[PDB]
Amino acid sequence: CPLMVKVLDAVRGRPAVNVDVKVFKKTEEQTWELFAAGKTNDNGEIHELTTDDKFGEGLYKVEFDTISYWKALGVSPFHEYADVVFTANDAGHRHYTIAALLSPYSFSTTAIVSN
Amino acid sequence: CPLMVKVLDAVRGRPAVNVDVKVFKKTEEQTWELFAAGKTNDNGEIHELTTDDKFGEGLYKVEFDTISYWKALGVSPFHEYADVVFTANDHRHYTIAALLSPYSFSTTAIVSN
Amino acid sequence: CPLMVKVLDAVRGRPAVNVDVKVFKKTEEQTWELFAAGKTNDNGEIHELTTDDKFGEGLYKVEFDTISYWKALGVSPFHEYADVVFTANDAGHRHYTIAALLSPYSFSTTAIVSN
Amino acid sequence: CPLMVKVLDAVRGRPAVNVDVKVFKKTEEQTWELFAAGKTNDNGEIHELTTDDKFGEGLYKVEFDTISYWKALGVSPFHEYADVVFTANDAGHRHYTIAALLSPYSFSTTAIVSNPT
Ligand SMILES: [Zn+2]
Ligand SMILES: [Zn+2]
Ligand SMILES: [Zn+2]
Ligand SMILES: [Zn+2]
Ligand SMILES: [Zn+2]
């Protein structure tokens, strides 16, 4: 599984469950085309997402729908969403885990890249 | 000054100097239109990014060009760039703080009156 | 396994391997007594730090030896070490994961608590 | 001013006001002696914490009382407190800002170190 996410909620000290996650890929026309999608499970992870075959070289954007996550818990957050944009698989085959730590007015995102 | 940025480098423990920062604003055509731009100074701040008059209600995107920042220091980082998107319903002042590491990016919003 | 750690290196985008982790527990005499110790593996995890039986109610301190970690990579960091202090198991039995993200001049810590 | 703190609350997007802060310094006897203390103001800063004269070489610990901060806002937090320990002024005279970002189950800290030339 070459693209994973792990989302944690810094307010509750729990994985963030039901965070809608879209992955886009940049096209020759310089637009973002929807590549993959899911919802974080009980562990704040998205199983599947894509495959070594269908992945490939290019520029990807992983978007977490943070505003819906917070609003559903009665919190009024700052950000519309949290993006991670990066070039993938251009210097040999890697696996990417995108970790996101969520607070209402703050976010962090960290990439773990393996071989 | 109603929209500020403060950028820190977590590797050096110094403000991040010369980080290209673009601010966009969402339009009725559903596109991002360039609204403001600058480069962080010696304190990692951009000084007069916009003005109370020009900065109305709407949806804004602050973009930090992190890949250039790092590459120029001989580091090969993870992110192409780092976006902060939010709706200003202001009257309020917004500081976007970013902490930069090669494989991690952290952002906090400070909102005042 | 009721007390886990997960340590990531924000410079390399890799789990932080060989970080010395000591766990202390507060005593009646108001001192810290050494409770457990380990070194992060290839995934930045310590695997069996204590056990449900030995890990009771009280005040604990998890210490990461960050200065040795960085110096060994030729970096001269800011912090001597990074501590996480917390009360555990006082409102019923929980499992605790302490996540740390390391940069030379910055450290971040998050707790994940489950039932 | 050679030692500042700046404390932010990640839940509110506001400076964290009235965070109790203590600074300790390590002694020859291997113990922590209280060196300075304050409460964060409206900007989450404590300013005149110490002075270039009083603040020499050594090992210091800056402690934020996060549990009181949160409890006073009705939040039951995870950490008892948050410590930042570091050696200061051993390679020439510097100024230190310790920035802390607080969430109920998460704590983040960054050091900004400058050379007053
Ligand atoms: Zn593979
Ligand atoms: Zn876009
Ligand atoms: Zn158990
Ligand atoms: Zn101690
Ligand atoms: Zn001085």
Swiss-Prot record, chains A, C:
Localization (cell): Secreted
Residues with 4-carboxyglutamate modification: E33
Modified residues (Sulfocysteine): C1
Principal place of residence: secreted
Function: Thyroid hormone-binding protein. Probably transports thyroxine from the bloodstream to the brain.
Family note: Belongs to the transthyretin family.
UniProt protein name: Transthyretin
Originating species: Notamacropus eugenii (Tammar wallaby)
